[PDB]
Ligand SMILES: Cc1ncc(COP(=O)(O)O)c(C/N=C(\CC#N)C(=O)O)c1O
């Protein structure tokens with residue numbers, strides 16, 4: 001894996017911001033795209049754009065083969081058994097809402113529990129809030145240990161035989177924690193629950209195998225993994241999706257329409273209402289071809305190196321707190337003592353450096369961390385140690401600059 | 407309006423299919439894109455891709471300004487009063503589902519009526535089926551007159567003071583009928599109903615003015631109007647959207663998140679859960695700039711000419727039935743006596759000609775037409791009379807060829 005060859009594929013990296021070379025360290029908010037992906041979209045619109053599933057004219061057939069072909073690429077990529085288990089959606093958020101709407105709201109009664117964790121992104125919180133409220137069921141949180149990881153002991157404690165759903169994140173977008181999803185699926189099942197896995201932060205960065213994880217549902221977002229905006233996937237076990245009603249209704253997802261009553265398509269089309277995200281899914285396919293060609297394990301090793309290097313160089317700074325465990329995915333959330341993270345982010349941008357400041361859509365987590373906001377640098381396959389040097393050099397500068405003011 | 411200059415902007419038109427120049431007559435299924443749109447996407451991914459609404463780094467600000475800027479372009483384009491009334495969605499279908507979920511399901515009780523018409527696309531049928539079933543309300547259909555138009559008399563007949571919702575299409579994707587939306591909004595309101603307008607076929611092809619139409623909701627799809635796939639709009643009167651709960655929950659659409667209860671953003675963000683369709687909305691903005699620069703009235707005049715020419719040259723063929731009225735949008739649905747439309751479409755593709763065969767997602771309409779399927783040619787700003795000549799010449803050939811077989 002050659003990082004110079006990789007960065008050469010991402011036009012957006014080669015520019016300056018505020019007179020400094022761009023240092024993009026915000027891949028957890030969204031990733032940048034290689035030429036292979038952008039040229040996939042261009043070729044689609046330049047050459048074979050048409051609506052799909054009719055199969056009567058040439059361009060229509062090509063578009064359909066592209067779109068269905070990308071479904072197959074997603075299937076192999078996360079090791080699902082069947083294309084019937086791969087549903088294209090607008091994103092992780094919509095995917096998780098569909099499970100909340102079609103599965104939760106139809107399978108929860110007073111006394112039933114939904115179990116989540118304190119570290120969850122909103123997308124994996126609010127749908128469950130709404131679903132328990134709609135059904136008079138109960139929402140519970142698995143506690144976190146002090147380093148921001150989860151103990152299986154706490155899982156057995158929180159999951160009861162009244163738990164219908166466990167919903168947890170694969171990798172935290174804030175702490176960097178890789179959760180024990182597989183062991184959690186076992187505890188879920190032992191108690192008669194399904195597990196729903198929020199895979200938005202894991203999928204771009206490490207090999208996903210839904211056969212090995214035995215998750216019941218798994219959600220991911222194209223934009224975080226070198227792919228177009230506006231597209232995601234819901235994976236669900238075929239037996240569960242067969243029993244769920246659609247979340248949206250319309251053309252494409254029907255079989256017979258009468259005046260008052262309709263019947264549905266087979267999976268996966270049951271869950272894809274209206275003209276689908278044709279170019280986006282095809283570009284998501286291109287993104288998957290690109291990542292597989294580098295290798296998810298390679299990308300993962302690369303991130304292990306950047307994260308270990310970042311954690312070391314952060315510990316060389318006084319007045320800097322880092323949140324979460326030592327063993328982590330490729331990001332670091334932190335604060336400078338006595339500098340608001342908004343200001344850290346502003347000052348970093350003046351130096352070319354893109355990070356995120358705020359709640360990272362994890363308000364409960366911030367409360368648990370006893371902070372109101374943090375700053376975050378997040379990495380991907382195009383980042384380098386040199387860029388981590390610039391970040392830590394800029395944080396040192398920031399500390400001194402704000403010393404000068406007071 | 408110079409058609410040669412217009413066609414020069416659409417790379418996909420300049421190719422052959424089966425050894426013949428492509429003749430694309432399937433714009434009602436999806437439209438082709440000009441360079442201005444494709445290069446908008448390229449420039450977004452090449453240059454300023456980032457997540458939106460943070461506003462802490464340079465690319466993030468640019469992405470946000472692009473996305474919010476496109477909201478403004480959509481607002482001016484349909485003459486809404488406020489960006490708070492413009493919600494980006496995945497498409498017409500999703501837009502109509504949101505109204506069905508958030509407005510209908512919360513405002514219908516036994517004895518309440520939803521009124522639709524027999525000519526509606528599925529997207530404007532199934533959501534209402536589901537909503538009346540969920541609420542024990544009643545669904546009614548306005549009858550059609552023999553030419554496939556609607557009489558206001560029939561509207562007053564069907565809409566009662568128990569009608570809560572009237573949902574009708576602006577322009578039929580099958581008959582070509584332009585419905586009397588404005589007069590229908592008046593009848594709706596006189597009886598205490600809102601009206602929901604399915605604008606998927608109107609928006610690409612004619613000026614939209616929601617102030618003049620006084621519609622309560624209006625839905626449209628980017629892919630049909632020179633814009634990217636995967637994006638649409640829901641317009642709704644600000645006072646109605648203020649009172650509707652969100653259809654999806656997650657990051658971006660919240661204000662405060664506690665463990666069990668959350669509060670929402672102001673409009674329009676209330677209705678935009680998760681990372682939004684950033685590049686798609688920006689490209690939809692480019693599409694709108696492109697169409698406004700030609701002029702919707704010009705595009706409309708062009709289509710009037712193609713439709714009048716097509717209807718004339720179709721009446722020069724024996725054994726050809728055309729469905730719907732004389733005054734029409736830019737398409738023609740038809741059948742050859744004794745040739746299945748699937749076969750017509752297959753034979754047309756061998757000649758380079760792209761049309762659609764099937765139900766056109768209007769199964770109730772086909773039943774009313776007493777057919778099981780039809781063929782359809784649909785036009786846009788890049789089509790010509792010469793291409794209509796090829797179509798009618800090919801239909802003549804098809805008729806003779808199928809005579810030979812028998
Ligand atoms: C673990 C996890 N779960 C859900 C989401 C939301 O995904 P999306 O916005 O693509 O619908 C995300 C997206 N995270 C963002 C998106 C932004 N901005 C972040 O900055 O951390 C995530 O990381």
Ligand SMILES: Cc1ncc(COP(=O)(O)O)c(C/N=C(\CC#N)C(=O)O)c1O
Nearest residue numbers: 051274275435497498499527579606627
């Ligand atoms: C009047 C009307 N109402 C709803 C839809 C569905 O819009 P979408 O598939 O973009 O969600 C459409 C899309 N129509 C199609 C789409 C396809 N294929 C067609 O072939 O007529 C429409 O024309």
